[PDB]
Design a protein around this ligand. Structure first.
Ligand SMILES: O=c1ccn([C@H]2C[C@H](O)[C@@H](COP(=O)(O)O)O2)c(=O)[nH]1
Ligand SMILES: O=c1ccn([C@H]2C[C@H](O)[C@@H](COP(=O)(O)O)O2)c(=O)[nH]1
Lengths: 275, 281
């Protein structure tokens, strides 16, 4: 059975048995598994996913950036509404300049625990570089059961433009394969979840490449999994669609370090989503 | 189907198809759901679980303690091997006194982000009191999707006697019920997982009681779920056992705040487990 049916089945289950809150319909606790083997890339097909946005945002997290203007320069506007000087003033951050998202993902992955000042501050050597730590552990002690990267930082969540949906991820190595599990506290099934699967499947492909392992599975765990009430009609139309075979992903060259990837290094072949 | 079959089915699946890597046999990524409704308490029945240890350890976390001697005074020795002055010296903590586990669960739940000194330091008002925060959010904004308590603190994990297995938990409210999901990075299916289910089911019962809600579900999510190779014979004996109906749990009085619970406040009725099975190191 096509892996995308897990996603469609959960949407069907939520709309048919979920809890209505004043508007969403939700369920609590779900888990999906997507194979990443033999070049398979789980970019959902029953609706087009924003591949360019997935990859550019992930490269921006890997650089440790908290500056939304670096995404805007690449025509990525996912963090726009939360980076305006007007929105930042409404939250309570008065000396915060346009584009400064605060200590969001990039900062937590590269500098967890460092005191945040602004998006231009040199944080070199400050805090825990969890992304490099996971790479070092996968290479040196792959059976380790603490290969974790955490973005949910209770100290910093109030300083962020938005609290992170992707709380932590854990890696696992077996059979020459790298697997990843993501704990996502809040999942908009309609518009958020396909993008989120692609982000963490892509991070797994990147870390596998630089650790000389093959991608295994991406395990997606959800907390509050929900459908917005105004998307139900559109989702009933999407549930009529049969998933198309997933595209393949190849990395075009031997990339040495996780910081060395560029958008052009990815070759996404055969992506044929429904209209 | 009895909820305990989810646990038994995973043990069977791990031994049959798990990855062989002391040797472990493991799978990555699993999820179980245990109903906590109508007074049902998921204290596993295929082996007798240490109920007084589950409860006393949880009350010790709620107090914010990191002192294993407070558990020892109650004849609870679960944190002993990791609190000896010899073990603490091997880890690299030289000025650490006997019983000082470092900034483990109790400290992270009550004082996340505070600088840890020792187990006797007064941390009043320091760091984030995530447990009280969870309670305030459930009472004031129950639809909130950020009702989280995190014990995985990358800054403090190197100072802990042991890195936490229980990384975070999230709460959810619907139809007057409180549910909890635990993300457990590492799960020993033999002796670890039954105790761990009981701890977070009990925490859900306690928070539901103080927030005027009814317990809903406990969702248990696992990362590296495994069995030790030397426990396979014992686990094959456990798999022959049929689960008995779960016991019930009642809270004997109206407890106002999460910090006010005492072990005598719990009434666990009808616990009828099969005997313990030796699973040693
Ligand atoms: O990567 C992301 C970011 C956001 N959301 C959705 C989940 C919720 O619908 C909303 C975030 O709102 P809160 O859970 O923080 O209230 O956006 C996702 O699905 N994925
Ligand atoms: O509450 C706990 C604590 C420990 N363990 C088990 C999991 C592993 O077998 C071991 C911890 O070792 P690491 O995962 O930290 O290596 O103890 C549990 O199952 N539950």
């Amino acid at each position: 059975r096509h892996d995308e049916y897990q996603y469609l089945d959960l949407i069907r289950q939520i709309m048919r048995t979920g809890n209505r809150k004043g508007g969403t319909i939700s369920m609590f606790g779900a888990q999906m598994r997507y194979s990443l083997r033999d070049g398979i890339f789980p970019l959902l097909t029953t609706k087009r996913v924003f591949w360019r946005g997935v990859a550019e945002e992930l490269l921006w997290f890997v650089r440790g950036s908290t500056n939304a203007k670096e995404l805007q320069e690449k025509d990525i506007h996912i963090w726009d509404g939360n980076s305006s000087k007007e929105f930042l003033n409404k939250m309570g951050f008065h000396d915060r300049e346009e584009g400064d998202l605060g200590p969001v993902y990039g900062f937590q992955w590269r500098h967890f625990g460092a005191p945040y000042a602004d998006m231009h501050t040199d944080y070199t050597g400050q805090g825990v570089d969890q992304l490099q730590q996971v790479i070092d552990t996968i290479k040196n002690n792959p059976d380790d059961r603490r290969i974790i990267m955490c973005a949910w930082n209770p100290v910093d969540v109030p300083k962020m433009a938005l609290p992170p949906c992707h709380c932590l991820c854990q890696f696992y190595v077996a059979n020459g394969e790298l697997s990843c599990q993501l704990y996502q506290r809040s999942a908009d099934m309609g518009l958020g979840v396909p993008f989120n699967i692609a982000s963490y499947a892509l991070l797994t492909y990147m870390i596998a490449h630089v650790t000389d392992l093959k991608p295994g599975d991406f395990v997606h765990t959800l907390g509050d999994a929900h459908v917005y009430s105004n998307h139900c009609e559109a989702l009933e139309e999407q549930l009529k669609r049969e998933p198309r075979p997933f595209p393949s992903l190849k990395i075009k060259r031997k990339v040495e370090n996780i910081s060395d990837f560029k958008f052009e290094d990815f070759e996404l072949d055969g992506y044929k989503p429904h209209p």
